Amino acid sequence: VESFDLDHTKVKAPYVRLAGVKTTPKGDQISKYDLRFLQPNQGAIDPAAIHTLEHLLAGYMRDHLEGVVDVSPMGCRTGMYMAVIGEPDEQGVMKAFEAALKDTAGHDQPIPGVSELECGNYRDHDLAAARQHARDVLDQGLKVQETILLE
């Protein structure tokens, strides 16, 4: 329940998907979401670009969604992972993500927090590619993806 056993060949990117739910000791719920940009195993986002997307979405997701724990790039680089304090709400996360991506696509200012003081690899960034990935997702159109379990 904390991490659904997803069949990666059956999903349709881009999408938002509830990936698991963890209940805290006092009864609160931590919802985990799979924010998929690319189709699994059909290519990956460049390290620089996903790093920049991390910098931009960290802030833009919080402008549109409450209770965000963190937004992290997935090791597979086809999307972002995000934990949110609150009961599952795929529709609300989808709308927040869509709004955050519009902010990212239209981000023509310096990348926030890029320096040796605030960033662990300040030289590895790509705004242009980050913005274009946001645009591609919006062009294709997002949807809530159901979890197809493996056998």
Added chain:
Amino acid sequence: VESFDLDHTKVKAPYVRLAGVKTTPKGDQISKYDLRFLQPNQGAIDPAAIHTLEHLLAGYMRDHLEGVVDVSPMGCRTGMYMAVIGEPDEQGVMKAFEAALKDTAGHDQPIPGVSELECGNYRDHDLAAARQHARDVLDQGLKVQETILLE
């Protein structure tokens, strides 16, 4: 408080560091930790290797630490990020991380979950490099790193 404003030029990798604390509506605490392998801006872990480390630590951290929400690679690729349900406990996370790294360094079996069904980029893995990064951290020696705030 949910994300301390760290001065990246003052830390000493490798280390474990409480990076922030988020309190849930019912009063539980979600502790966030910075598991730093490399010194900020002195190099990065290859995408394949960090992806494999993600696969291995997801399981090995849970063998040694309760309440783990998720273990994710940082966009800067100098370490891993992890959220844990529970009050701050840097010492306990350090010991868990050390034990998990010994499991990783000694992992000579197939990488878990590597296939088109269970992984979003199954072709991008590097066990050898993953294991060597675990060994390097253990050789250098871990310590709990205090957060030096920026000005």
